[PDB]
Amino acid sequence: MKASRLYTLVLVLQPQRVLLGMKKRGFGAGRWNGFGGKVQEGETIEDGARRELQEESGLTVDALHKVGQIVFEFVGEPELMDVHVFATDSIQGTPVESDEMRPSWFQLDQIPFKDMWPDDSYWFPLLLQKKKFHGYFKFQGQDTILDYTLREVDTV
Ligand SMILES: Nc1nc2c([nH]c(=O)n2[C@H]2C[C@H](O)[C@@H](COP(=O)(O)OP(=O)(O)OP(=O)(O)O)O2)c(=O)[nH]1
Ligand code: NA
Ligand code: NA
Ligand code: NA
Numbered sequence: 001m002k003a004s005r006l007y008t009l010v011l012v013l014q015p016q017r018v019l020l021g022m023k024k025r026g027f028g029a030g031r032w033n034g035f036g037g038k039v040q041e042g043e044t045i046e047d048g049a050r051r052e053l054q055e056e057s058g059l060t061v062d063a064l065h066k067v068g069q070i071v072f073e074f075v076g077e078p079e080l081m082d083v084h085v086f087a088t089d090s091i092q093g094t095p096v097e098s099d100e101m102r103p104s105w106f107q108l109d110q111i112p113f114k115d116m117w118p119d120d121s122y123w124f125p126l127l128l129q130k131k132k133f134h135g136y137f138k139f140q141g142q143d144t145i146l147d148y149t150l151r152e153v154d155t156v
Helices: 045-057 120-128
Strands: 004-013 017-023 065-074 080-088 101-107 133-140 144-152
Touching (some): 004 120, 017 045, 045 080, 045 101, 120 133, 120 144
Antiparallel strands (some): 004 017, 017 101, 065 080, 133 144
């Protein structure tokens, strides 16, 4: 079984809107997403999530809730991406554009699925329903899912 590398993903989810960022370079460029990246040596996963949110959007938070975990496999890539997904409703500061991301708010009846990773269509609705989840998706390239599993869980 492949080795895995730890990543974070943070969704600022308010009652009528969600904050996403347009990825300007790198992995997932051209897609709207939450904020996140590789966990670094010595930090907890939650602290890595807080750090990435600050670096990519300028925001800080008073509390981060773990809402899901998704493992990604790409054909032809040796490592799995083990993504720990967090949400918060209560941020401090305004979002700012970074080298990585252009933040923008979306109303919750305008979630931009066509410009998001394809797997987000499956798990994002669970997030919105306050349901914790575990997932796994195998991709060929950026657009094609070959296999996936998704489970509602009581504990992430
Ligand atoms: N919504 C969504 N997010 C995903 C998927 N796959 C995936 O890795 N992610 C997230 C996890 C991370 O937030 C981000 C990938 O991390 P990254 O490449 O931006 O990491 P980084 O900031 O450390 O990278 P870099 O500056 O070194 O280029 O994308 C997916 O299918 N859907
Ligand atoms: Na980053
Ligand atoms: Na990133
Ligand atoms: Na999509």
